[PDB]
Amino acid sequence: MNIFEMLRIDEGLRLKIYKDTEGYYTIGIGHLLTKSPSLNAAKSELDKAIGRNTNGVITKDEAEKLFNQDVDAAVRGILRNAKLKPVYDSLDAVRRAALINMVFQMGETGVAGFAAALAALAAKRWDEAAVNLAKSRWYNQTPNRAKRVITTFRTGTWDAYK
Ligand SMILES: [Cl-]
Ligand SMILES: [Cl-]
Numbered sequence: 001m002n003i004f005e006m007l008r009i010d011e012g013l014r015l016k017i018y019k020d021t022e023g024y025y026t027i028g029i030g031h032l033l034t035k036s037p038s039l040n041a042a043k044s045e046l047d048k049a050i051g052r053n054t055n056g057v058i059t060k061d062e063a064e065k066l067f068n069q070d071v072d073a074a075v076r077g078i079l080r081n082a083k084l085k086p087v088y089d090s091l092d093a094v095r096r097a098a099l100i101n102m103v104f105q106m107g108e109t110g111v112a113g114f115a116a117a118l119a120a121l122a123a124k125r126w127d128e129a130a131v132n133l134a135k136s137r138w139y140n141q142t143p144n145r146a147k148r149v150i151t152t153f154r155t156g157t158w159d160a161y162k
Contacts, residue, residue, distance in 0.1 A: 001158040003071060003097045007104060009161060010145050015063060017042055017056040021142055028063035030104070031070060074100050077108040084112055087122050098152040106138065121153065130154040
């Protein structure tokens with residue numbers, strides 16, 4: 001298992017514009033296009049991102065390229081955030097993947113906000129981090145995905161994904 005496989009499972013793959021759990025236009029493997037409620041706006045963003053006139057449909061290769069870029073960016077955002085970086089550096093490989101998953105999903109500003117869970121994670125108090133993590137809108141809104149990530153932090157293994 002790895003970060004790409006992990007996200008592909010949490011996000012799925014859709015080759016045609018769709019609305020994510022929040023009602024926003026997305027495409028591919030969770031690539032958010034826009035928060036605007038307008039499909040044209042979404043399409044326009046999609047075109048700009050792909051580099052061609054898409055008509056709201058992309059290919060698999062295209063979806064995968066957006067994904068790599070997105071994973072790369074989530075990694076780079078973590079490394080550049082004063083709050084996330086030292087946590088990530090302190091973690092083992094599996095757990096770093098769990099962190100990248102969260103950032104991919106919520107953006108780094110959103111994750112940097114879990115002051116308490118981040119401190120617990122850095123101190124290696126897995127169960128305390130897990131309980132805190134669960135007290136969040138994130139967990140209440142997308143509970144199955146949240147539980148998968150929280151378990152990964154708690155255990156340090158890929159069990160929730162096998
Ligand atoms: Cl883009
Ligand atoms: Cl969910």
